[PDB]
Structure formats: structure tokens, C-alpha cells
Design a protein around this ligand. Sequence first.
Ligand SMILES: COc1ccc([N+](=O)[O-])cc1O
Ligand SMILES: COc1ccc([N+](=O)[O-])cc1O
Ligand SMILES: [Zn+2]
Ligand SMILES: [Zn+2]
Ligand SMILES: [Zn+2]
Ligand SMILES: [Zn+2]
Lengths: 361, 361
Amino acid sequence: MASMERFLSVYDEVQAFLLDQLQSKYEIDPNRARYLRIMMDTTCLGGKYFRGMTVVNVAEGFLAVTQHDEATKERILHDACVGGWMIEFLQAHYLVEDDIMDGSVMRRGKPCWYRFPGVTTQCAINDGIILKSWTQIMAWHYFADRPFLKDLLCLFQKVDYATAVGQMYDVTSMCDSNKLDPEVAQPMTTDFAEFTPAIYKRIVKYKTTFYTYLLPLVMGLLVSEAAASVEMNLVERVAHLIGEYFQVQDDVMDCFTPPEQLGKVGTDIEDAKCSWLAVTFLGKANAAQVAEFKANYGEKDPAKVAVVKRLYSKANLQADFAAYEAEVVREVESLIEQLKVKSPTFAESVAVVWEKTHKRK
Amino acid sequence: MASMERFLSVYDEVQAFLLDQLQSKYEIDPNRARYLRIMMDTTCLGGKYFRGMTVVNVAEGFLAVTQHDEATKERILHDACVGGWMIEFLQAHYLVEDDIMDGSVMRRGKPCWYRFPGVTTQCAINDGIILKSWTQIMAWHYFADRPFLKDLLCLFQKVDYATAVGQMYDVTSMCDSNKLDPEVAQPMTTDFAEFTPAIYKRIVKYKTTFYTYLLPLVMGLLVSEAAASVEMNLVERVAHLIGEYFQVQDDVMDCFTPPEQLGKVGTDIEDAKCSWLAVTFLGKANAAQVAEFKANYGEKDPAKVAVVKRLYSKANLQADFAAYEAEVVREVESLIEQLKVKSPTFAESVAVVWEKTHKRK
Ligand SMILES: COc1ccc([N+](=O)[O-])cc1O
Ligand SMILES: COc1ccc([N+](=O)[O-])cc1O
Ligand SMILES: [Zn+2]
Ligand SMILES: [Zn+2]
Ligand SMILES: [Zn+2]
Ligand SMILES: [Zn+2]
């Protein structure tokens, strides 16, 4: 059975289980069951499923080299699909809440969930909470008897926590750390001293690499009972490296990819985000350029946004991106070589993840 | 050691553990650690700690009749305090998110967290997420080796889910179920046909009885390794009964308790909530009264709110409350008697919970 069709078929199974359980144990009525079905579809479907499918692909790699009864193969793949949907539902939770937090308009070509006329922020915040709860409901149901349940739940909850911490790093990245204070409205930085590579790297590591790369890779190992097969320190290092490259790409696209192709209007400049573009620009600008950047960054005024985009273009950040990319290639190939020492099979799965990430349009 | 002082001392311990771990494993800086410390204090402290202290009191009851080394007594009480703080932090998550969802102004005499000048909704939604994540972080740390860990985490996550489902029941209680539709802005009911005792009971059961009464009672049993000591069906029944009475009291106070004593301005009438007052009024009103209620309910206009409060007063709902209270007393005393069959000790703990709830100002 092709991997994607299996993964989509398990979605339908998981949805039916969750909604039937709401009817049989939570006293839900059919109209609210329908609302939640539509909410689940709208928030969980329509992406590329890169995260969930990585769990499946890692498990497939091990199936190819490990002796198993057919029924065991099917159980492992089913577990990989359920675990993959746990990650997709976790992402769906974060996108629902983040779109509300940020006042975002569009997501994947459609209005953000909270903007649907019959949803509203009042319902959408709670819908996002339900999405997160569903990750646990499906784990307890499908993995109740599994040897990996404890490790999987502990990993999942540490990754979720890291992600929430990273969101804090992200939403506060345009303020001076020494002025953070719940009692005092937060001004934007004027010196941009905290727009550094190390600080940027911390934001990205926590806000997206744990849930986008580390969690799918390790979940694939856990459902395969293969985690002792690998050097976990190398898995972490390669996850954080590839995840950072993925975010740098997203940052560049926020500014330069047409909104029709991107699926939203990028607002990182207006929002004064600590983006790879801003950090790298400040890493090579002269004094006059820095001053012009400070005069225009972080303002909704489209004229000022236009000055910033021109500063970026004139600064030839394309060349910095190429140099960054070439270094990531060196380092990821090195880590893949190191992963071959204990598991050539897993190293190949990581090579596939890198190729997909690197070649992403 | 007095129970409350022990419970508060464990708060300081848990806070220090969480913040130290953020520094040592999550790369946090001191100013963000300070923000999160203030967030934790502001959102978790200042209530009566009824929920968390119930865990401690249930555990104390069993300690009085069970043979244990002193060090075991101390471990059980410490676990009960950590588990109690898990519930308090879960509540703190729900109050942060609910105040945002509802546009609330005050909570416990202070501004709602999201209203603090240096917080804002953008940060506060995520702060609420961190609060929930902390419930799991503390469980894995303090209960890692405990026999009850699996049961406790499974219970906790089912109660959290029930609570989120109940919030959906609550926020949709003024709409006609057959018209729920993410695509269509939701009108308020005009017939109020779904303002019934059974529908009200479903809202309250899920939105507050699971986390306010069932979870503390059963967590107290789990940290005492005493759950086989009791009839779990009776624990559920008495939790749902006492929890409903607790919410009816809250509903009456929303309308009639002065805001200085209540700690907020009640807006259930303006928000068109399915409250005990509205259901009970509609259960005894004549046609003219029903028509006047429909003409004024669910509007911010203070003149209309005033008509509703007068309708309630003229309807002598005080007498319905007294009859409701007398029936709850009968039923709770009956369930306590039944609990004595297998555990007089636990029955007494429940009697104490009821007395505290019943005598609440
Ligand atoms: C977590 O795995 C992945 C994450 C992202 C991509 N990508 O192509 O962007 C591919 C992956 O297999
Ligand atoms: C969950 O236990 C309790 C809940 C509420 C109260 N009360 O007095 O409101 C007392 C309790 O011991
Ligand atoms: Zn965001
Ligand atoms: Zn972006
Ligand atoms: Zn509410
Ligand atoms: Zn209330």
C-alpha cells in the first residue's frame, strides 16, 4: 500500500474514532460533532504532511531491513501513521493559536480558522485546545499496550513545551530583553542589538525544529523500537541543522515569494520579526544602511516596508543565502556520514528528509 | 506540618525547578525567566486552592489509617501537593484562555492577565499554553518512578479534554444546535428551547465538574495507591452532583453578588449564557414573562439587563434555589453513606468537600 494513501486512510479512521467517542462517552450531539469534524478537516488537512509522513518513511526504512511477520509490519505502519497524525494535529493546534496571536489573515490559501464567520476567536482558541487534546486521546487509545508509550508521551510533551517556549522567544524577539515586564507596554527595540545569529538560532531551534524535525525522526524510531539503533546526539544535531535551514527558507519566502504562491501576505517586516534577512542584513550593512533600516523597520506603512525590501535587495542577501546553504550542505552530509556508523538505514532516511527540504520550491 | 503551608512551600519548589530547568535545558535568559515567574505567580496564586488542597486532604485522610514509614508519609504528602499544583496550573491555563475568549475585564480583583500592559493577547494565549505544558513537565519530573504515573497522566488528559469539550458546550449554549456552522455567523436563539435542565447539566458536568471535583478526588486516591479502595462509579456520581451545585452557586452569584465581593462584573445575562437562573426562570414563567425575557436577554444594554434581573427577582428564584439545595443535600448524603461501605475514610473526605462547598459564602 502506498505510504500516502495509508496515511490518509488512517486520518479517516482516527477522525471516526474521535467523533464516535465524543458521542458514546462525552454526550455530544450531532451538530456539534459536525462542527468538530469540519474544524478537524479545515485545520489538519491541506498541507503537505511532511512531518507526519516522515514518521511513516522512517518506519518504512526499518521494515525493509528487519524480520517481521506481515501482521507486525502492518501494526508498525499503522502506529507510524497514528504517530504522524499526532504531530500533524499538534501543528494544527499551533497554527490555529498562532494565527489568532498574530492577527493573521490567510493560511494555505484560505482564511485563518478564527476568521470563519461561524467560528470567531472565542470558539477558535478552544478549538485549538481540543486539537492538542486529541493528540493525547489518540495516543492513549491506539498505543495503550505499546512498549514505547511512555517514551513517546514524554518526548511529545517535552517537544510541545519547547515549541511554546520558542513561540515566546519569537513573539518577544523585537523587544529589548532588559525591558521585558508584564506591567509595562513593550516598545520595539531601537538598537537591534539582539538581532544576532546566536539569538536567531535560539528562536528557530525552539519554535520549529523540535516539532518539525526532531519529533518525527524520533517518533519514527520509537514506533520501530529502533531508538537504541542510533546515536541520539547525532539525531538532535542533524534535526536542529535541517530545521534551521527550513526556517531560513521560510523567512526568505515571507519577504520575496508572491502571496499567491505563498498562501498568505508576509508581514515579518511590519511585525519587526527577528528574521534571517534582518539579522543577515545587519551583519553586512554600513552605518547609513543601518540607520535607514532602523527608520523603516517594524511599521505597517507600506512605504516603509518598501524601503526595507529595497535595502534587502541592494544588500545582495542572495549571496549570503548561497553561502549559508553551502555550509549547511557540508554539515548535513557530515552528520549523515556519522549516522551511518550505527545505522545506514536511518542515515538514508535522514538523507531523504534533507533532499526533500533542500529541493522544496 | 500544616497542610496549607506544605502546599505553598511545594509551589516555591516547583517554581524553582521549572525555572531552573528552563535555564539549564531550554537556553532561557534571566529576563524571560523573570517574566515567566511573574506570569506563574499572577495566574496560579491568589485563589483559595480548593482543588489542589482537596488532593492533599484526601491523602491525609488515608495517612491517618494506613501504616507507613515516616519517609513514606512525607513522600505521599509531597506527591499530593505536586498533583494538587498540577490541577491549579490546569485551572490557571483555562482561566487565562477563557478570559481572552470572553473578553473579560477582571479576575480575582485584578485585571485579567491578557490585559496587563506588557502581556497583550499575543503573549497571553501562549502563556496559557505554557501553563498547561508545565502540568506535564512537573508530572514527569516528580512522578517519573511512581507506580501511579500512567493512571494519573491518563486521567489528567481525559479530564482536560472533557473540560475543553465543556467549554465548547458553554460558548455555544445560546445558539440553536441545528444552525451551528463554521461558514455562517451564529445568531442567538430566539426560542430558548435548548435552555433546559438536561442541557444545562451537560454544560456544567463537562466545563467544571471533571476538573474541579472528579480530578482532585481521584488524584488523591492515586497518590495514596487507594483507588481500589473505593467504588469509582460512586466517586463519579458524587463529584458530578457536588460540582453541579458549585456551578449553580456561581451562576446565582454572577447575577446578584456585588462586583467588589465577586471580584469581577458578571456578564452572563449580556452574554446570553445558559445559566441556572435563566433555565429555572423559563421553567416557571408565564407567557408574558417569557416574552419579556426574550425581548431583553443577551444584550449589553444595561436597561435590558436590568429588566432581566427584575424578572428574576419577581420570579422568586430564591425558593427554587432552596428546593434545589435541599435535594442536593439528600442526594449527597446518600452517596456519602454508600461510600462508607468500602471506605469510611474516603467518605469522610467527601463529607468535608461537601461541607466546604455548601458553606461557601
Ligand atoms: C520532518 O521531515 C520533513 C520536513 C520538511 C520537509 N520538507 O520538504 O520541507 C521534508 C521532511 O521530510
Ligand atoms: C474539589 O474540592 C473542593 C472544591 C470546592 C470547594 N469549595 O468550598 O468551594 C471545596 C473543595 O474541597
Ligand atoms: Zn507567530
Ligand atoms: Zn514565516
Ligand atoms: Zn467562558
Ligand atoms: Zn460564572
